[PDB]
Amino acid sequence: KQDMPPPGGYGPIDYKRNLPRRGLSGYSMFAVGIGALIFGYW
Amino acid sequence: ITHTGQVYDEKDYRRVRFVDRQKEVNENFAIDLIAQQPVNEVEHRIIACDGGGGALGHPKVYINLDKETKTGTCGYCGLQFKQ
Amino acid sequence: TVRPRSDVTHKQLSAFGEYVAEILPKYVQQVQVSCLDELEICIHPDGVIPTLTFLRDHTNAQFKSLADLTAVDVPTRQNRFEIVYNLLSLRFNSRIRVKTYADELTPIDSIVSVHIAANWYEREVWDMFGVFFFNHPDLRRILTDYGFEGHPFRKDFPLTGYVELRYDDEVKRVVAEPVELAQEFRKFDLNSPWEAFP
Amino acid sequence: NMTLNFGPQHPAAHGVLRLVLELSGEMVRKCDPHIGLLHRGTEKLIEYKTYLQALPYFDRLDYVSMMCNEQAYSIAVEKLLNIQPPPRAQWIRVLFGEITRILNHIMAVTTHALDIGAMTPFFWMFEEREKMFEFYERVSGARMHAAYIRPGGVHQDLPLGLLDDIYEFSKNFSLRIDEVEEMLTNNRIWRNRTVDIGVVTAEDALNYGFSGVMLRGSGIQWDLRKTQPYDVYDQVEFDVPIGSRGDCYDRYLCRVEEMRQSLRIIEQCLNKMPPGEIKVDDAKVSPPKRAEMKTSMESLIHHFKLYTEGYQVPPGATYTAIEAPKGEFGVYLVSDGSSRPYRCKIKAPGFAHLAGLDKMSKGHMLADVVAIIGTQDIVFGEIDR
Amino acid sequence: TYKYVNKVDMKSATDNAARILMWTELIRGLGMTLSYLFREPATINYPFEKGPLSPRFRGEHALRRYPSGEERCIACKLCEAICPAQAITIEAEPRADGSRRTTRYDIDMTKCIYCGFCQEACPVDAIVEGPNFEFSTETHEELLYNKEKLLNNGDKWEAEIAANIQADYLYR
Amino acid sequence: QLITVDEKLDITTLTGVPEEHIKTRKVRIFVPARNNMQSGVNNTKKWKMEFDTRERWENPLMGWASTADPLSNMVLTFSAKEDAIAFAEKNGWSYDVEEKKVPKPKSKSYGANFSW
Amino acid sequence: LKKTTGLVGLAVCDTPHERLTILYTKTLDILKHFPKHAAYRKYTEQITNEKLDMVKAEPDVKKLEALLQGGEVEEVILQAEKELSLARKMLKWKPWEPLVEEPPANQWKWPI
Amino acid sequence: GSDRSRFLEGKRAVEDKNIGPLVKTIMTRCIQCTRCIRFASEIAGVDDLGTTGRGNDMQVGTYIEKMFMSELSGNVIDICPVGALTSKPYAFTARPWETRKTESIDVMDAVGSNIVVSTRTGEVMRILPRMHEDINEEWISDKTR
Amino acid sequence: TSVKPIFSRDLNEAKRRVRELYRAWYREVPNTVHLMQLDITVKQGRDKVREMFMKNAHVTDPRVVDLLVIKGKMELQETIKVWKQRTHVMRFFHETETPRPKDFLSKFYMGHDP
Amino acid sequence: SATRVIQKLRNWASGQDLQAKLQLRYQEIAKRTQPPPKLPVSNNYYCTRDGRREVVPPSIIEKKAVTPAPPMKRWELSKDQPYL
Amino acid sequence: AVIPHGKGGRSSVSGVVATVFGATGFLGRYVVNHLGRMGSQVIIPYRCDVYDIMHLRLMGDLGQLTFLEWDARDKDSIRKAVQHSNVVINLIGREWETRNFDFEDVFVNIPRAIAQASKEAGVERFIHVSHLNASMKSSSKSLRSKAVGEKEVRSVFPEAIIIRPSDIFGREDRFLNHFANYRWFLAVPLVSLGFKTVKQPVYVADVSKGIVNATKDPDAVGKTFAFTGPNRYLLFHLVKYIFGMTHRTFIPYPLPLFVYSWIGKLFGLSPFEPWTTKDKVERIHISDVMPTDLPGLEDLGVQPTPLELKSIEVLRRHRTYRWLSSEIEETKPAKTVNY
Numbered sequence A: 001k002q003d004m005p006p007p008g009g010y011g012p013i014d015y016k017r018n019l020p021r022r023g024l025s026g027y028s029m030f031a032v033g034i035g036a037l038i039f040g041y042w
Numbered sequence B: 001i002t003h004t005g006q007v008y009d010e011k012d013y014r015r016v017r018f019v020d021r022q023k024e025v026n027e028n029f030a031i032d033l034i035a036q037q038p039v040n041e042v043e044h045r046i047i048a049c050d051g052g053g054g055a056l057g058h059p060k061v062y063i064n065l066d067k068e069t070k071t072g073t074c075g076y077c078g079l080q081f082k083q
Numbered sequence C: 001t002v003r004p005r006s007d008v009t010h011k012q013l014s015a016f017g018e019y020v021a022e023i024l025p026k027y028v029q030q031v032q033v034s035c036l037d038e039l040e041i042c043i044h045p046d047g048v049i050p051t052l053t054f055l056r057d058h059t060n061a062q063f064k065s066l067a068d069l070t071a072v073d074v075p076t077r078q079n080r081f082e083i084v085y086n087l088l089s090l091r092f093n094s095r096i097r098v099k100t101y102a103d104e105l106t107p108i109d110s111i112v113s114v115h116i117a118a119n120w121y122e123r124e125v126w127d128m129f130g131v132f133f134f135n136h137p138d139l140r141r142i143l144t145d146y147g148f149e150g151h152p153f154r155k156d157f158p159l160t161g162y163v164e165l166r167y168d169d170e171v172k173r174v175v176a177e178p179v180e181l182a183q184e185f186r187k188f189d190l191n192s193p194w195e196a197f198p
Numbered sequence D: 001n002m003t004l005n006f007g008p009q010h011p012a013a014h015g016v017l018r019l020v021l022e023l024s025g026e027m028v029r030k031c032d033p034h035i036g037l038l039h040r041g042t043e044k045l046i047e048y049k050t051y052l053q054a055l056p057y058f059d060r061l062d063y064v065s066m067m068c069n070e071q072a073y074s075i076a077v078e079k080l081l082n083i084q085p086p087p088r089a090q091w092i093r094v095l096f097g098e099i100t101r102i103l104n105h106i107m108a109v110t111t112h113a114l115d116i117g118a119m120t121p122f123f124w125m126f127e128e129r130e131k132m133f134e135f136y137e138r139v140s141g142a143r144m145h146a147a148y149i150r151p152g153g154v155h156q157d158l159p160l161g162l163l164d165d166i167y168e169f170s171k172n173f174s175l176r177i178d179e180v181e182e183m184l185t186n187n188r189i190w191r192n193r194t195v196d197i198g199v200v201t202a203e204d205a206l207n208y209g210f211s212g213v214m215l216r217g218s219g220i221q222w223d224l225r226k227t228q229p230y231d232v233y234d235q236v237e238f239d240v241p242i243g244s245r246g247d248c249y250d251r252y253l254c255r256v257e258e259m260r261q262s263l264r265i266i267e268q269c270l271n272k273m274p275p276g277e278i279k280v281d282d283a284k285v286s287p288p289k290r291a292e293m294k295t296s297m298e299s300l301i302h303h304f305k306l307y308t309e310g311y312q313v314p315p316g317a318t319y320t321a322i323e324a325p326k327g328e329f330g331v332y333l334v335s336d337g338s339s340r341p342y343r344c345k346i347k348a349p350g351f352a353h354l355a356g357l358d359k360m361s362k363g364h365m366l367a368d369v370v371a372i373i374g375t376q377d378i379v380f381g382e383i384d385r
Numbered sequence E: 001t002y003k004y005v006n007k008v009d010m011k012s013a014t015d016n017a018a019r020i021l022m023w024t025e026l027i028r029g030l031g032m033t034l035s036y037l038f039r040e041p042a043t044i045n046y047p048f049e050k051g052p053l054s055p056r057f058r059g060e061h062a063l064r065r066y067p068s069g070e071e072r073c074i075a076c077k078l079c080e081a082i083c084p085a086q087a088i089t090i091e092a093e094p095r096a097d098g099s100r101r102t103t104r105y106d107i108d109m110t111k112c113i114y115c116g117f118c119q120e121a122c123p124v125d126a127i128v129e130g131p132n133f134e135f136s137t138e139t140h141e142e143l144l145y146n147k148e149k150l151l152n153n154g155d156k157w158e159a160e161i162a163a164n165i166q167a168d169y170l171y172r
Numbered sequence F: 001q002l003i004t005v006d007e008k009l010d011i012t013t014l015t016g017v018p019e020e021h022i023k024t025r026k027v028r029i030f031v032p033a034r035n036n037m038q039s040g041v042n043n044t045k046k047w048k049m050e051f052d053t054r055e056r057w058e059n060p061l062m063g064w065a066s067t068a069d070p071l072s073n074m075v076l077t078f079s080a081k082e083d084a085i086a087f088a089e090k091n092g093w094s095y096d097v098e099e100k101k102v103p104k105p106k107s108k109s110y111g112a113n114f115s116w
Numbered sequence G: 001l002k003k004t005t006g007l008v009g010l011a012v013c014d015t016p017h018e019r020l021t022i023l024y025t026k027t028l029d030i031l032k033h034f035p036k037h038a039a040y041r042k043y044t045e046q047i048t049n050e051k052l053d054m055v056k057a058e059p060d061v062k063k064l065e066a067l068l069q070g071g072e073v074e075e076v077i078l079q080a081e082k083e084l085s086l087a088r089k090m091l092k093w094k095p096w097e098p099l100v101e102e103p104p105a106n107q108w109k110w111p112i
Numbered sequence H: 001g002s003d004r005s006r007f008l009e010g011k012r013a014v015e016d017k018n019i020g021p022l023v024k025t026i027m028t029r030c031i032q033c034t035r036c037i038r039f040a041s042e043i044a045g046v047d048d049l050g051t052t053g054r055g056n057d058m059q060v061g062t063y064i065e066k067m068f069m070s071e072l073s074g075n076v077i078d079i080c081p082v083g084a085l086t087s088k089p090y091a092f093t094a095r096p097w098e099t100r101k102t103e104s105i106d107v108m109d110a111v112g113s114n115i116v117v118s119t120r121t122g123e124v125m126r127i128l129p130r131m132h133e134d135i136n137e138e139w140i141s142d143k144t145r
Numbered sequence I: 001t002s003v004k005p006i007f008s009r010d011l012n013e014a015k016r017r018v019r020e021l022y023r024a025w026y027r028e029v030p031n032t033v034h035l036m037q038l039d040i041t042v043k044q045g046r047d048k049v050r051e052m053f054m055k056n057a058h059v060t061d062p063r064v065v066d067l068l069v070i071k072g073k074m075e076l077q078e079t080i081k082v083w084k085q086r087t088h089v090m091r092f093f094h095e096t097e098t099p100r101p102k103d104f105l106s107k108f109y110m111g112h113d114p
Numbered sequence J: 001s002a003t004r005v006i007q008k009l010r011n012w013a014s015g016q017d018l019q020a021k022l023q024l025r026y027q028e029i030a031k032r033t034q035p036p037p038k039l040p041v042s043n044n045y046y047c048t049r050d051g052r053r054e055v056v057p058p059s060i061i062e063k064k065a066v067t068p069a070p071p072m073k074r075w076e077l078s079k080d081q082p083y084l
Numbered sequence K: 001a002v003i004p005h006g007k008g009g010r011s012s013v014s015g016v017v018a019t020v021f022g023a024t025g026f027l028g029r030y031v032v033n034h035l036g037r038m039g040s041q042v043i044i045p046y047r048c049d050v051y052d053i054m055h056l057r058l059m060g061d062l063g064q065l066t067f068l069e070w071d072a073r074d075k076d077s078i079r080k081a082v083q084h085s086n087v088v089i090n091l092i093g094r095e096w097e098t099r100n101f102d103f104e105d106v107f108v109n110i111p112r113a114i115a116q117a118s119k120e121a122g123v124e125r126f127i128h129v130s131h132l133n134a135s136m137k138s139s140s141k142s143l144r145s146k147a148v149g150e151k152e153v154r155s156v157f158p159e160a161i162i163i164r165p166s167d168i169f170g171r172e173d174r175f176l177n178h179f180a181n182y183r184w185f186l187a188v189p190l191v192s193l194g195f196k197t198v199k200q201p202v203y204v205a206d207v208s209k210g211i212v213n214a215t216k217d218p219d220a221v222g223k224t225f226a227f228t229g230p231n232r233y234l235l236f237h238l239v240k241y242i243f244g245m246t247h248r249t250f251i252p253y254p255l256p257l258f259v260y261s262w263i264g265k266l267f268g269l270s271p272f273e274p275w276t277t278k279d280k281v282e283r284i285h286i287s288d289v290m291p292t293d294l295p296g297l298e299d300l301g302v303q304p305t306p307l308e309l310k311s312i313e314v315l316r317r318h319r320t321y322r323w324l325s326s327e328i329e330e331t332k333p334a335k336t337v338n339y
């Protein structure tokens, strides 16, 4: 007949940002570095 | 020569164009193809001619095949209709 | 098939048109709210900086942005060019048109002082129609070729100009050439002769 | 100082800029952009062409935004005629207007990056743009300069499968935005290249007539889709993404948000598009249907006259502005009673923005100028007209 | 409605210096491009898998012919009076059958804009704008089409045109 | 201010028209005549200023009509004899004004054709 | 109080109530030298008065703003200061005078 | 007039006849406006044309097929607002929007009738009358057309 | 009749500008030939300048001479700067264009147009 | 369709679900050849529905000062996402 | 259609179709530009590769220039090129003798064949270009040969125009340049130090305008012509004029022609293109000619252009940077000779 939205709506699309915060913390990060870097000295 | 003449005179310098080339000329002349068609016999005094289609053919005009003397020809299809 | 319109606007703006005409009686020659619900204050050319300054800096009429400056050329009128300035008020969400008339030889002032947007538009009006803007910083051709002769959007200028360009081997440069067009532009006289009942 | 204009022919001059520059050592003392390199005479030619046969001049003013340029003219010619498009057509123009804002922004954000030096964002988004072109090709017939938003409506109805396919694109497009989002928003390199570059203060932006994301990036609240609504935008809900520091980054972030907000508007248009016809039914303004012109005489006469002569819009003049992706695009159409216009001043968001380049790019080096042009989203068709 | 876009305890201060010194934040971009070499390229094999189109695709012009074999063009001049690029010249005559047909028809395909204002104005469906888009030419003369490079052109794609006309006629 | 000049406003040096198209070219101010083929009088009300007709020739390759008269498609439209003569004099063209030809009033009566 | 007026340039102005009173009061004066019955003096003195009327009737900024119906007060000021400049500029251009010159004939008839 | 049609019925058709070698009467076009009959009887004194039949069947023509041979003949073309009878030589050579119209004078005869020469792309396509109250008041001879 | 002055009031006053442009151009021709690597000789060019400044040597409406200077100065700016390339400047010399004959018999003999 | 390891490579490296949002169209695409449609089409005198003739020529036109229009209502921060 | 029907320029037509055979080199690219700007069709027979005929495609307008392949060995290529023409022009000529073609072929055999077909096809004019001071026993293999052919041309196709140009200068020339090139190798090893030999040099355009005027000039039939040029200069002075204008140091150390003949031999040996050769060396030093009585450029309608004027354009390249910007009045003034 004529293109028209599917009865009951198309559905929901997401538009908002989702850049997902994640990651090691700083205290932990550094402590692996120095821990890998004292072992390099011993 | 195209269905509409155009044939260049031998002297015409406008013939170089086709040297090492050729001439685009349609072999299917509509003057003859339409003559190779059966006069559409009809019963009614007047007849329609949608161009063999509704909205895919030519505007719809009614032709008066009223005189056997002349087979009406829709100005659009060139189709002769034999009363 | 009849525009959905609001009469509130016609009235509100009409009222502003009387306000502007009262506040500036010396420069405004005619104010009219068209039926498209837009306003047009027609000012004497001398009123170009006064009228626009009042609109840019008045609490009851702040018209901060210059939408555009353009010049219709009606060749019949004595003062052919009709410079038209369209302005927008972000504060009151409304728009106004101030239009003044300028002839080929009589320059009008430059509003670059009132709005710095006009620095470019005024250069384009000079290049396109030949109107000159007084005390305008750097007026010079914006759109036409560096050596172009003639003002193009004037109604008396041929569509296709008088000069065209081509590369001439003999001189190894892009040389101009009087215009020869291989197919003149068929000008169609399509305009009905039965006028519409108003 | 040293006069080394940017390149008329340049790998990054957006085609045709000359931008003569004075080089005070590394930094640029002054810029004098020499546009005119693409002035085809669009406004002169329109005076010699009927209102339908001039629509095409418009999709070729800002070729990145095709159908929004047309939507201006179409709104301008409708107001002069005092006719309004049918309800379905108005939603279709808002549906296509938002697809154009996504495609303009994908153009502006990704090309800015390749100028900066980031090359991959362009490729990922351009495949997403070819998907969108296909939507223009599958409704109009062309992938560009469609000439679909004509006076009175759209030229033809949406094909039977378009709205499902627009849902599938909009459904997955959001991930593609933040994929570019993670690539450019937090990188040291992008923020340093973009943050605090070309700051424009609020009053200066209004005075220079910026009127666009350049206006909103500095924090001024103005969209023209919520201030002076056109079509049916008054029935769709969206949030203007205004800015706070009026600089490249804040302006970038605003452009990425409007792509997201446009997906919200496209979502509403698919959900609520009305059954109806796509063009006004007065045959004295929009052509008659193919079946009608081939079966009824009044329709043949109306088709013959409309195509050969024209609408003959009533004498008057109007300035109609719509929020084109770049900024306020307006047509000042002066009309005599004749079928062909008398004047058509295309206000180009871009003539004002490029003027601002000298003020915005002051105390900035050669590399900053490449970012300054990129953040004005200037395409020279609109500026040169 | 408006939306703001861009508007210290040691935990936070170390976190900031762990994202500036041992860069961890340009890494969220390197893994982001590593996420794409392992996906399937979108490239189509071009010459063998031409991209997708629509029956509406406007390309190389062609003059349709009535099945019978009679040219459909009745030289109205309803298609150069609208052609905005001013590209068409269709000088005509009575064809000596008494019928009405062209002796001349023309497009300069270096002026046309593929706008299809000629296929929607034609009251007979003679001039169409076919789905060709591989007709590039090494010369300028091969683009100034005549009535015989448009009619045998239309004597070529008519199997492929009519399907698309019949496919879109209702919407038009 | 208000300096006085004593001459027509010759802007021929400001127009930018190549000399030969400002010298050997005659404008013809006239109110277009009606298309006998129709009876509409709306196309015979405004004075037009059209230029002389120069060579319209044939493009050897395709047979199209070609021309070298830049001012060929030019039909400026004025609203009175006075305003057309002014523009032509303004631009330095030669004019050939043609007075308007409004039909005179012809008395028409239905019954008249019934007399004998 | 307010950390930042949204608009980039306009900077937070402490003592909004004060800055205004001075700017508004100066203006109420510059208008004085205007001809008795000059629309500008008659109207701009009608506005400046109402704003000085609220600038002193309400001491909470956010509140004040709503009343003056402007943007951030840092803006109500920006405007108060510009009207003053127009008021000075107007007293020289003497806009109140009779029209300079009536349009030439038929300089505003569009269907020409 | 009206944007649409309500005539969902069958149209009529008349039979094309030959009125001469100058006038092509595709009279199924005729709106029975009787201008032709009058001109033929009041300007040209040739009363050969006439209405035949009543009802919708009224046909405006020459009952027996006698050609309309007279000078002043071609004016019928210009005077029939419908394109029922039009010019046979200028049958389908052009279409009016294209025709560039230059106003000139008749040289075939010494009345010096005013005429408009309609030229397209540089060859004359038709010469039709332009009104001169005193000399040719809207009419031109069969020779000079 | 009365007319506002564009920049000068009397033709004499204006001519002061016309000369202040001649000088400028004259003192520039030499520079251009060298800068734009043009091939025409300084003398040759300086000739052109006089020709032009001379071509316009008949108008008496100050406003027009007030206007041609401006247009005139603008053309210097571009030429003084190198905003104009060789192509632009050399176009003042109709290098390829075959000068049209003027003799009647010379025109009758070619081209139906006057 | 990709080896799960390779695709988990792209999900882990991207940080986002990636099987869901494909940039490639496999069955997502509507098939062509949609069934033919049937588009939707007294006192309908054009003199009543005249948009073109409805318009009229422009109107030409103690007291209290009047603004061009009531001052624009200031917008308010978005409820779903005030800051992004 | 020999009726020119248009305002002069591209898109007009002067109605003269023409086959200009040597339109791949130096002189024919200017001929096509004038015949072309004169809007006349030009059937340009090219045996080259299309990539090198493109430079010709814009020197004309839509349809004006037509190309077709021709090889001198076979006719029917000469025949179809001249089949629809009315004008024919011969510009064939090669300095060296490639293994496949001798001065015999490029100057006699070939022009003869072309002219053969020219008369056969009915072309009215067979403009032929033989060298000035080029007669039999002119002690140079080519020049002698060239004249032999001039006869063959006249015999087969009488009423032919024969232009005999002097040395032709102009951009991309091999006259001024050969001399200019000497800069690269040592210094000008002129013979007779360059004195005792005088040359009249003519600009390519002057010759090109003449050939075009001749194709369209009625009295030109059966008329030989010598396009000598405005000034006669001694060779030493002209090399010195090439230098100074070239802005590179000049040294006219002398040597004899027997040695020099031997020298170029080796250069000729070069497979691609002789930098110089015996035949060239001869036509430079020994070749000297005083025109006496032959209608000239002025006679045909061209004002010969002096070398004093258009020498920047052809030597401004041979300067080192820092001198490139040098103007003309600065160039070392030259001086003319009579001898």
Ligand SMILES: CCCCCCCCCCCCCCCCCC(=O)OC[C@H](COP(=O)(O)OCCN)OC(=O)CCCCCCCCCCCCCCCCC
Pocket: A034, A037, D188, E020, E021, E022, E023, E026
């Ligand atoms: C306590 C034990 C005894 C003492 C031990 C020693 C003391 C502790 C040492 C801690 C060292 C921490 C890391 C320091 C080195 C890293 C480089 C660095 O210092 O960062 C500089 C720069 C920071 O950038 P920015 O945010 O602009 O900071 C400046 C702000 N004005 O960084 C940059 O922006 C550079 C960006 C350039 C582009 C990078 C692109 C990504 C590169 C990925 C490489 C992947 C492979 C790396 C490994 C290769 C191995 C061969």
Ligand SMILES: NC(=O)C1=CN([C@@H]2O[C@H](COP(=O)(O)OP(=O)(O)OC[C@H]3O[C@@H](n4cnc5c(N)ncnc54)[C@H](OP(=O)(O)O)[C@@H]3O)[C@@H](O)[C@H]2O)C=CC1
Pocket: K021, K022, K023, K024, K025, K026, K027, K028, K047, K048, K072, K091, K092, K093, K094, K095, K101, K106, K129, K130, K131, K132, K164, K165, K166, K167, K168, K169, K174, K175
């Ligand atoms: N200064 C001068 O140059 C002077 C020249 N002349 C005469 O004028 C004529 C034109 O001179 P110019 O153009 O400089 O000479 P070129 O060396 O440029 O050769 C002329 C043309 O002839 C073609 N040609 C050469 N050999 C052959 C061959 N064997 N078969 C087919 N075509 C060939 C060349 O094309 P291709 O690249 O395909 O070989 C070239 O385009 C010459 O014949 C010469 O005798 C006379 C006096 C002075």
Ligand SMILES: COC1=C(OC)C(=O)C(CC=C(C)C)=C(C)C1=O
Pocket: D010, D011, D012, D013, D014, D015, D111, D379
């Ligand atoms: C947006 O402006 C620009 C273009 O126009 C759309 C370009 O084509 C180009 C060149 C295009 C490519 C693919 C290098 C550049 C660099 C550009 O900045």
Ligand code: SF4
Pocket: E072, E073, E074, E075, E076, E077, E078, E079, E080, E090, E121, E122, E123, E124, E125, E126, E127
């Ligand atoms: S093509 Fe269609 S429109 Fe153009 S002329 Fe032939 S029929 Fe009339």
Ligand code: SF4
Pocket: E082, E083, E084, E085, E086, E087, E088, E107, E111, E112, E113, E114, E115, E116, E117, E118, E119, E129
């Ligand atoms: S497509 Fe548009 S431009 Fe090309 S021909 Fe048909 S109408 Fe003219």
Ligand code: SF4
Pocket: H029, H030, H031, H032, H033, H034, H035, H036, H037, H060, H079, H080, H081, H082, H084, H085
């Ligand atoms: S005039 Fe034309 S229309 Fe009126 S009746 Fe005679 S023929 Fe029929």
Ligand SMILES: [Zn+2]
Pocket: B049, B050, B051, B052, B058, B074, B075, B076, B077, B078, B079
């Ligand atoms: Zn039919």
